[PDB]
Amino acid sequence: MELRHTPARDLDKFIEDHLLPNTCFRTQVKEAIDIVCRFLKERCFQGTADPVRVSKVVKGGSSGKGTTLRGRSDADLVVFLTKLTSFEDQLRRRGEFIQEIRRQLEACQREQKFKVTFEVQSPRRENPRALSFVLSSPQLQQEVEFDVRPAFDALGQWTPGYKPNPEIYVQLIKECKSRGKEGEFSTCFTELQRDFLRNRPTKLKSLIRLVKHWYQTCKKTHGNKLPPQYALELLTVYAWEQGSRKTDFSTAQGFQTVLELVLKHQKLCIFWEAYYDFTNPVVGRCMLQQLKKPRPVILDPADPTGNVGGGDTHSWQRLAQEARVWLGYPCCKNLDGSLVGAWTMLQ
RNA sequence: GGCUUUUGACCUUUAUGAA
RNA sequence: UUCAUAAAGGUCAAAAGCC
Ligand SMILES: Nc1ncnc2c1ncn2[C@@H]1O[C@H](COP(=O)(O)CP(=O)(O)OP(=O)(O)O)[C@@H](O)[C@H]1O
Ligand SMILES: [Mg+2]
Ligand SMILES: [Mg+2]
């Protein structure tokens, strides 16, 4: 049964039946992650005469957040290398480490330990930001898709709960404003992005799944011309924080609220102070700049240079058209045909 | 009320890499 | 000691499906 035909009272059942991970899926992925992690820690750089060390492999993305879609969520890994020493460095040397990681993976395949399938993407253009591939192992019951990124460890050993030293963002902003980049180093702060969602209430994670599924369904019609998926994820968090703040709430009202916020994209200016704030003048000046951009502005809680909004109003136009149609579906409607109603946003 | 799953919190333990 | 990935054991909670 398609989401498109599911009424409001069955959305939680729909999430349960199609979207939530089952035991096998999340078990096989964690096995696949283990294979790649061991490889990176025990093999991949053991050949370098000048030792390249991996300080940590961070499981990011939906996998680290607990918002994965069953049988559809990739594994996102950020591998932190001791020899990348700064944002400048990561930006210039990321290409090398990718290629090298590719070679060693090949040399493992050649050995019959597992099988990897990459996908050439042309034109190559700017250095690659990631290495993507599919993994297959006699060990595993299924294949898992991967996304691997090398990164400079800006945070050091970071403990969830603490705001990162502002001087780290001072430095971030300095390089970004000099090289004309914005949001290019969000991977270094993956752990903050993971922390922003990991501890949220269970049903909120479930709604995020639903919104993600709706968004993927939209992509069938619009390909890659939509705003970034992360924008919608953050938009869902914003909806809950201003309209509920409760562990229990109606999924349909949540769904409707999000769809309505999409239609109001020309008024969206959303940001958080979970990891930075206006205290430090430099960080403060950069936040303020971002909030003066054309709407919608959705500021990455982990990255003050990062407007997840995407800066492309055609994308939001397209997404808004779909939001208009989906508001006529049984998804947000009661039994009598009336809409369940959206939450109302605190200041 | 009963059965179970998913997602987190806290306290232990094992392997691997790193500071 | 701490950080990361996987596994194991104990305890607590949230939400969901089913009866
Ligand atoms: N536009 C963006 N700006 C900043 N960070 C982003 C971003 N897009 C993605 N990210 C970060 O990189 C992670 C991996 O992205 P994706 O794999 O593309 C989606 P996901 O969040 O993993 O869910 P999904 O893979 O289950 O669909 C995201 O969770 C987010 O933390
Ligand atoms: Mg992902
Ligand atoms: Mg990914």
State the structure-solving technique: X-ray
User: Does the annotation list A318 as a binding residue?
Assistant: no
A188, A81 contact by CB (below 8 A): no
Atom of ligand 1 nearest to the CA of A194: 31
Q: How far is the CA of A41 from the C1' of B13 (A)?
A: 22
Residues A213 and A330 occupy one common structural domain: yes
Residue A118 backbone class (left: φ over 0; alpha: ψ -120 to 50; beta: rest): beta
Residues A92 and A225 occupy one common structural domain: no
Place of tokens 């914005």: A182
Residues A59 and A5 occupy one common structural domain: yes
In this structure, the number of other CB atoms found within 10 A of the CB of residue A106 comes to: 12
Question: CB of residue A159 closer than 7 A to nucleic acid strand C?
Answer: yes
Range list of H helices, chain A: 11-14, 23-42, 61-65, 87-109, 166-179, 190-198, 202-222, 229-243, 251-263, 281-290, 313-326
A251, A207 contact by CB (below 8 A): yes
Q: Per-residue b/e over A110-145, b at no fewer than 16 CB within 10 Å? A: eeeebebeeeeeeeeeeeeebbbbebebeebeeebb
Total domains in the fold of chain A: 2
Q: Which CATH number covers residue A59? A: 3.30.460.10
A148, A77 contact by CB (below 8 A): yes
Please tell me the distance from the alpha carbon of residue A98 to that of residue A86, in angstroms, as a whole number: 17
Please tell me the distance from the alpha carbon of residue A291 to that of residue A170, in angstroms, as a whole number: 18
End-to-end Cα, chain A, rounded Å: 38
Please tell me the distance from the alpha carbon of residue A38 to that of residue A107, in angstroms, as a whole number: 15
3-state class (DSSP) for residue A27 = helix
A266, A295 contact by CB (below 8 A): yes
- Strand-pair partners of A79: A57, A150
Residues A150 and A186 occupy one common structural domain: no
Residues A69 and A111 occupy one common structural domain: yes
Query: Considering A141, A160, A179, which residue would you say is the last residue of a domain?
Result: A160
Residues A261 and A230 occupy one common structural domain: yes
Tokens matching residue A235: 């938009």
Query: Considering A132, A160, A188, which residue would you say is the last residue of a domain?
Result: A160
Residues A151 and A213 occupy one common structural domain: no
Q: Which CATH number covers residue A229? A: 1.10.1410.20
Residues A6 and A138 occupy one common structural domain: yes
Please tell me the distance from the alpha carbon of residue A309 to that of residue A97, in angstroms, as a whole number: 30
Query: Considering A160, A178, A203, which residue would you say is the last residue of a domain?
Result: A160
List, as one string, the DSSP characters of A260-281. Answer: HHHHTGGG-EE---SS--SSSH
H helices then E strands: how many in chain A?
Answer: 11, 7
Domain containing residue A242: 161-347
Listed resolution, Å: 2.2
CB-facing half-sphere around the CA of A299: CA atoms within 13 A: 22
Residues A119 and A226 occupy one common structural domain: no
